[PDB]
Structure formats: C-alpha cells, structure tokens
Amino acid sequence: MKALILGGYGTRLRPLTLSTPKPLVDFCNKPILLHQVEALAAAGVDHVILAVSYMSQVLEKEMKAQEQRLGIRISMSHEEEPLGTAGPLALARDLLSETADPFFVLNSDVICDFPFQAMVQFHRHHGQEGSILVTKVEEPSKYGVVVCEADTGRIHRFVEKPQVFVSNKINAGMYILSPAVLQRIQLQPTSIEKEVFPIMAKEGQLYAMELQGFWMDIGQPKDFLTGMCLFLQSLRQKQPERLCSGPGIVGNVLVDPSARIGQNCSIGPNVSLGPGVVVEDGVCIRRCTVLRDARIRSHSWLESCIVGWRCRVGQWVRMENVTVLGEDVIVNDELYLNGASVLPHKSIGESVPEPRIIM
Amino acid sequence: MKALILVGGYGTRLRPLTLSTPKPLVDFCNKPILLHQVEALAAAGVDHVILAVSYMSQVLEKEMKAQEQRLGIRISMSHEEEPLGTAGPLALARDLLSETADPFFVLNSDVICDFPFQAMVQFHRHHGQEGSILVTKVEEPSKYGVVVCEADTGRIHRFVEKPQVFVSNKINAGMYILSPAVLQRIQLQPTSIEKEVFPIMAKEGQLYAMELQGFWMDIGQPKDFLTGMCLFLQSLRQKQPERLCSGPGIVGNVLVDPSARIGQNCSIGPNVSLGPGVVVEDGVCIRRCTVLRDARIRSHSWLESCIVGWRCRVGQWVRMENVTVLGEDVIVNDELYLNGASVLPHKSIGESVPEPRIIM
Numbered sequence: 001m002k003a004l005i006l007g008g009y010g011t012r013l014r015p016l017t018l019s020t021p022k023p024l025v026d027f028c029n030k031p032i033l034l035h036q037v038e039a040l041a042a043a044g045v046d047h048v049i050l051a052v053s054y055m056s057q058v059l060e061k062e063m064k065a066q067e068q069r070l071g072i073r074i075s076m077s078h079e080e081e082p083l084g085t086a087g088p089l090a091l092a093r094d095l096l097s098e099t100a101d102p103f104f105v106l107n108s109d110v111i112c113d114f115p116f117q118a119m120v121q122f123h124r125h126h127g128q129e130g131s132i133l134v135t136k137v138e139e140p141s142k143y144g145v146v147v148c149e150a151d152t153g154r155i156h157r158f159v160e161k162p163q164v165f166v167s168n169k170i171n172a173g174m175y176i177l178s179p180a181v182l183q184r185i186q187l188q189p190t191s192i193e194k195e196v197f198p199i200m201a202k203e204g205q206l207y208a209m210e211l212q213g214f215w216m217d218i219g220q221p222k223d224f225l226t227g228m229c230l231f232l233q234s235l236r237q238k239q240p241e242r243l244c245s246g247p248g249i250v251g252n253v254l255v256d257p258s259a260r261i262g263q264n265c266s267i268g269p270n271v272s273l274g275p276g277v278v279v280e281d282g283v284c285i286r287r288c289t290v291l292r293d294a295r296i297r298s299h300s301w302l303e304s305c306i307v308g309w310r311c312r313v314g315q316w317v318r319m320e321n322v323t324v325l326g327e328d329v330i331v332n333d334e335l336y337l338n339g340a341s342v343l344p345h346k347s348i349g350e351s352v353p354e355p356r357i358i359m
Numbered sequence: 360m361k362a363l364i365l366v367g368g369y370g371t372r373l374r375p376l377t378l379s380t381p382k383p384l385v386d387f388c389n390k391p392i393l394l395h396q397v398e399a400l401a402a403a404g405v406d407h408v409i410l411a412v413s414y415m416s417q418v419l420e421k422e423m424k425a426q427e428q429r430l431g432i433r434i435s436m437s438h439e440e441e442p443l444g445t446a447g448p449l450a451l452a453r454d455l456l457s458e459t460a461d462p463f464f465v466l467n468s469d470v471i472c473d474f475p476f477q478a479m480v481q482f483h484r485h486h487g488q489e490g491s492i493l494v495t496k497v498e499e500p501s502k503y504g505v506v507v508c509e510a511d512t513g514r515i516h517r518f519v520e521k522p523q524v525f526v527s528n529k530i531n532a533g534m535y536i537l538s539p540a541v542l543q544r545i546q547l548q549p550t551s552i553e554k555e556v557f558p559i560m561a562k563e564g565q566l567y568a569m570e571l572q573g574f575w576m577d578i579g580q581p582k583d584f585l586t587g588m589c590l591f592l593q594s595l596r597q598k599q600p601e602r603l604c605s606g607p608g609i610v611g612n613v614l615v616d617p618s619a620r621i622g623q624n625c626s627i628g629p630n631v632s633l634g635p636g637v638v639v640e641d642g643v644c645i646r647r648c649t650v651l652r653d654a655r656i657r658s659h660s661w662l663e664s665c666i667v668g669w670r671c672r673v674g675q676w677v678r679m680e681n682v683t684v685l686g687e688d689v690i691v692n693d694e695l696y697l698n699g700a701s702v703l704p705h706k707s708i709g710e711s712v713p714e715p716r717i718i719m
C-alpha cells in the first residue's frame with residue numbers, strides 16, 4: 001500500500017518556518033518528516049507521496065537523499081496554487097486510483113508512536129470507506145470533538161466547534177482511506193476535514209480508532225515543547241540507552257554526538273541538543289530545544305526555549321517563556337528574553353520583558 | 360571646637376537596611392557612613408563630637424565606645440526619649456555647645472561627600488555672621504529645595520523649599536556651621552531646623568552659603584545609595600588608586616575587602632563594593648551592586664544595581680536588576696528573577712518578582 005504526506009508555510013512557530021519548511025525543522029535531532037517516513041518504512045509501505053505547494057527545492061534535495069538512504073520510493077506531488085488538504089489527494093488521484101487498496105494519509109505536524117499495522121487490522125475489521133485516528137486531550141475547548149460508540153468505533157457526528165461536551169476524543173491526524181473516497185475528493189482548493197469528512201461522517205462511513213497515549217500536534221511552539229517532552233519520555237521507556245547520561249545531566253536529555261557540552265553546567269530535564277551545538281561552562285538548560293550550530297555562551301540560563309539554527313546566545317542571558325529564536329539570531333550579553341519570538345537574522349541588544357515579536 | 364551629628368532615628372527610605380541596623384551603621388563601601396564622617400572630622404581636628412539619637416541603638420552605643428577608644432577623640436551621646444526632630448537635638452545638647460563661645464559644626468548622617476572642614480571654617484571666619492551652609496549643584500532642581508546666592512559674598516537672600524520656579528540651581532548639602540546665638544534661638548520642642556529655624560535665619564539674612572567643587576550625595580534612598588557608591592568609588596579611584604583591587608576578571612573601580620573571597624572565572628564589573636567576609640562563587644557577574652558583609656552569592660548569578668544585605672544567600676542562576684534591595688538573612692532560591700523587589704529581612708523567596716514590589 002501507499003501513503004500520502006500532506007506543503008505550505010505552517011503559520012504557527014513562524015520564526016522556524018521562515019527559514020526551512022515546517023516538516024524539515026529538527027524534532028529531537030531529526031526532522032518530523034524523517035520520523036514519519038521511518039515509521040512508514042517500518043510499516044512496509046513501498047512508496048509514499050509527499051504533496052508540496054510551496055516551492056521546496058531543499059525538501060526535494062534531502063528527500064531524494066532519503067529515497068536513496070531508506071530503500072522506499074517517493075513521488076513528488078507539485079502544486080502551483082495551494083490546494084489545501086483535500087486538493088493534494090485529488091492532484092495525485094491517478095496514482096492512488098491504479099491500485100484498489102486502502103492508503104494512509106498523514107499530517108506532518110503530528111508526532112506519536114505510530115500504530116500502522118494495528119490500524120490496518122482495524123480498517124480490515126470494520127470494512128467501510130475511511131477510518132480516523134482519535135486521541136484524548138485535557139482541553140476539549142480547543143479542538144473539534146468526535147463522538148464514538150463502544151465496540152464499533154463508528155462516528156455518528158463530527159463537531160468542529162467545542163463548548164458542548166459531546167465527546168472527549170480529538171482528531172489525531174492519520175486517516176486511512178479507500179479509493180471511493182478519492183472518487184469523492186475534488187481538485188479545487190477545499191480542505192478534507194472541513195467538508196469531505198463531514199459528509200462522510202453524516203453518511204456514517206467514518207470509523208474511529210484510538211491510540212494508547214503519547215500524541216502531540218507540534219504545529220505551535222509551546223506544543224512543540226510539550227511534544228518534545230513527551231517524546232523524550234517515550235524514548236526514556238523505549239530506548240533508555242540512547243539518551244545521554246552524565247553527572248551534570250538531569251532527567252532525560254537527547255544529545256547528538258557532534259554536540260559538545262562544557263563542564264560544570266547543569267543540563268536540566270527534557271532538552272534535545274542538536275548536532276554541532278556548543279554549550280559552554282555554567283549554562284543551565286531545562287526544557288529547551290537547541291537546533292543545529294547554535295552556540296550558547298557561558299553562564300546563561302535557558303528554560304522552555306527554541307534556539308534556532310546558527311544562533312549565538314551571549315553570556316548571562318536569561319531566556320524563559322518559550323521564546324523562539326529564528327536562524328542566525330545574535331543575542332548580546334546580559335539580556336533577558338520572555339516570550340520574544342525573534343525573527344531570523346536579528347541582533348538583540350535590549351531585554352524583552354513581556355511576550356512580543358521582535359522584527 | 361566641637362561638632363554635632365544628627366543620627367537620631369530610622370531612615371524611612373532604604374527601609375530593608377534600616378530595619379535591622381540603624382541608618383548611620385549601614386556599610387558604605389566596607390565602612391559605616393558615620394565612621395566616614397567621624398574619621399574625616401578627626402582629620403579636621405575636632406576634639407569631641409556629640410551624636411544625638413532618639414532611637415535606642417545599643418549596638419551604635421557599643422560600636423561608638425569602641426571607636427572612641429580607636430580614634431582618640433571623645434564622644435558624648437545625647438539621648439532622647441521621643442523624637443526631637445533635627446532642631447530639638449541641638450536644644451537638648453545646648454549647654455555642651457554653650458560651654459564655649461566657638462562655632463560648631465552640625466552634620467547630617469546621610470551625606471557622603473568630600474569634606475572641606477578647614478575651608479568651611481575659613482569661610483565662616485571670613486564672612487563673620489551667625490550660620491554657614493554648604494550648598495551644591497544638582498542636575499535636577501525639581502526635587503530638592505533651592506538656595507539663592509549673590510556672587511562674591513554667598514549670602515542667602517531667600518530659602519525656598521518648593522521647587523519648580525527656577526530661582527536657584529544650588530541645594531542644601533547637610534552641612535552647617537552654627538554660632539551659639541543660633542542655638543540660643545532653638546527651642547526644645549520637636550521642630551526641625553531646616554523648616555523654620557533656617558528660614559527666619561535667612562529672612563533676616565544671617566545665613567551665608569559656601570560651595571563645594573564636586574562629589575556630593577545624600578544617600579538616604581537606595582538608588583541614591585547606589586549612585587553615591589558609584590561616585591565615591593570614582594573619587595576614591597582618583598585619590599587612592601592603590602586601594603581598589605585590580606584583577607584580570609575585575610572591570611572598572613572595584614573595592615574588595617581583604618576578608619572577601621572571589622571565585623574563579625567571574626567578571627565583577629564597575630562600581631562594586633564587596634564587603635568583609637562575602638563569598639562570590641564561579642561565574643557570577645556583579646556590576647553596580649554593593650554587597651554587605653557575610654553575604655554569599657552562589658555560582659552563575661547575574662547582579663546589576665543591587666543592595667545585598669547581611670548574611671544573604673543568593674542562589675544559582677539568579678538575575679537581579681533594577682535595585683533589588685535585600686534585607687538581612689534573605690535566602691533567594693536558585694533560578695529566579697528579581698526586578699525592583701525590596702525584600703524585608705528573614706524572607707525566603709521562591710517566586711520570581713518581574714515588576715517592582717515589596718516582599719514581606
């Protein structure tokens with residue numbers, strides 16, 4: 001069977017997506033697209049189509065290298081206008097039509113551990129058009145809810161709007177679809193979840209499968225940080241010898257072998273250090289994500305932060321409240337950043353006391 | 360020739376320091392400010408000075424008896440049961456200033472400056488009238504009460520408390536030379552001298568005014584304490600450049616007590632007075648702060664413009680800016696941010712203070 005990967009300019013976490021595309025940003029020393037295609041190759045999908053409407057030549061580049069690395073083919077669906085999230089299915093519809101076999105369609109912003117063959121089992125057990133994945137959240141008033149009958153998993157109704165408490169369960173971003181669904185899908189830029197899932201739930205074709213746990217949509221920067229926390233938890237009780245252990249290391253940290261840490265510094269819990277980063281002496285880093293080539297100078301304090309590529313955080317810099325730095329941001333010595341989403345190629349010489357955007 | 364120091368009571372401003380030790384007893388560049396005034400006063404040649412205290416301060420009593428043995432000048436202590444203000448202390452010690460017909464100094468405790476005692480005696484002897492006032496420049500006339508002055512005599516025609524008319528640049532410097540007749544005016548009930556006694560003295564024009572050249576600061580408040588510490592280290596660099604401590608990780612004019620211990624690989628920036636017995640650990644940046652005695656600042660901290668009290672414990676990766684006055688025996692937990700936090704003594708902070716407020 002084949003699989004779609006859903007293109008263009010993820011508007012959230014904007015200081016990272018302005019430099020490289022949203023599926024290409026490193027999530028625990030690996031791009032999220034690489035995670036999804038590793039799990040797809042572990043499932044057994046022989047080729048996977050990655051729709052892209054934003055002109056992404058570097059995604060062509062690294063993806064051709066990954067075709068050559070991993071042993072599965074990849075087809076490149078290219079759109080000149082944004083066709084949304086259903087229009088990518090109808091552009092590549094003659095490829096999914098020439099084998100009558102159910103195909104995955106995947107969102108890129110979702111990290112979890114992926115029950116692909118169990119969802120194939122489920123789609124083979126219920127035996128209709130399309131199946132969804134659903135998960136639990138703590139906050140029903142932020143996401144659209146799905147009603148689910150016990151022992152069947154059928155979706156009676158699909159609600160986009162909260163505040164009614166009809167359901168706990170939330171869309172998880174994987175769908176499994178038949179080609180008859182693809183007959184229904186339409187080339188003009190409509191999104192799939194807005195109507196094509198609404199008539200399919202109204203007609204009752206849609207069924208729902210539930211995950212165990214560890215789901216995150218990391219389309220937002222604070223959601224990126226909570227997803228990185230839960231991914232380091234899942235790496236802790238799945239691959240405990242891949243996380244780095246040390247005397248000045250607290251909790252679960254992921255450190256790349258090209259990364260260097262100076263001595264007498266306290267790397268706190270839940271932080272991924274990218275390849276080639278330079279941490280000097282006296283730097284406390286808890287709950288942050290430091291992408292590639294980002295040098296953090298001595299005696300800094302960093303909590304809940306996204307440090308972009310080729311950054312230079314100076315000495316005695318305090319950064320808290322998920323301040324995202326873009327690419328090549330030069331933070332001067334002895335500053336304080338709180339909520340500062342800083343655009344790429346900026347130089348900061350002033351403290352940012354409340355959350356605002358620096359451009 | 361004698362002198363009187365007004366050191367009565369609790370200075371409301373800089374209240375987290377005044378709550379544990381008295382205001383003249385607070386360490387100003389590793390020395391109490393009253394030791395500064397009595398040491399320069401003994402450099403003048405005054406044989407005994409009187410200090411008039413309303414607050415019971417037994418620690419000031421025993422510290423001054425020690426300093427009496429130290430410098431070799433006598434000290435009698437005027438004791439008040441209720442507050443007598445600033446004119447009442449003159450009237451309670453009025454016979455000890457009335458024994459001998461000779462002009463005496465009276466001196467505010469909060470003033471730190473470069474003390475021209477001999478030139479002031481020469482100016483008072485030259486002009487030959489009742490009272491002599493030191494005046495100074497300020498950059499900011501709309502906070503402090505102004506004094507008019509004619510050139511080449513220095514007489515004060517008019518004493519104005521309220522600013523915002525710009526009739527004068529100069530303001531009072533807390534330094535007066537008074538004759539015994541001025542004391543003969545002063546009554547025993549608690550008025551303050553600068554509010555009426557100097558006003559009628561200037562009204563019949565007996566008051567004369569003398570200018571300094573520079574380096575004056577009333578340090579009653581905490582931000583004024585910091586900027587007076589900065590200007591004192593300026594003047595002390597320019598007179599005693601051997602006494603400030605030079606180092607590779609030391610920037611600017613830094614005074615460090617010999618009992619202080621400074622850790623490896625830390626940059627202590629300009630205008631820092633480090634008290635006796637303080638422990639600065641590795642990677643700690645201190646600029647423009649004054650750290651009073653026995654206070655420990657743990658590793659990788661950042662400190663700008665701050666007053667760290669006695670026996671404090673500033674933790675690790677704490678940032679302290681915008682005058683975060685710590686009292687005595689304040690522990691600050693690690694990884695916190697203090698901005699404007701005037702913290703009362705014996706407090707433990709586990710919460711970041713983002714805006715200036717008082718912690719009690």
Ligand SMILES: Nc1nc2c(ncn2[C@@H]2O[C@H](COP(=O)(O)OP(=O)(O)OP(=O)(O)O)[C@@H](O)[C@H]2O)c(=O)[nH]1
Pocket residue numbers: 006007008009010011012022051052053054079081082083084085088107108109219
């Ligand atoms: N290739 C193509 N991909 C698209 C287009 N629009 C959305 N996508 C993809 O649709 C997937 C899911 O949509 P969203 O969750 O809203 O993500 P997004 O489009 O990045 O938008 P934000 O994350 O809110 O900034 C994402 O992986 C997008 O890359 C498009 O017009 N062309």
Ligand SMILES: Nc1nc2c(ncn2[C@@H]2O[C@H](COP(=O)(O)OP(=O)(O)OP(=O)(O)O)[C@@H](O)[C@H]2O)c(=O)[nH]1
Pocket residue numbers: 365366367368369370371372382411412413414439441442443444445448467468469579
């Ligand atoms: N001994 C005695 N000293 C007094 C009394 N009132 C004021 N003083 C002293 O008067 C001097 C100058 O007065 P201020 O400049 O207003 O200082 P302060 O009384 O400490 O008040 P603040 O500094 O604003 O808190 C200070 O050195 C005080 O110690 C008093 O009632 N008894």
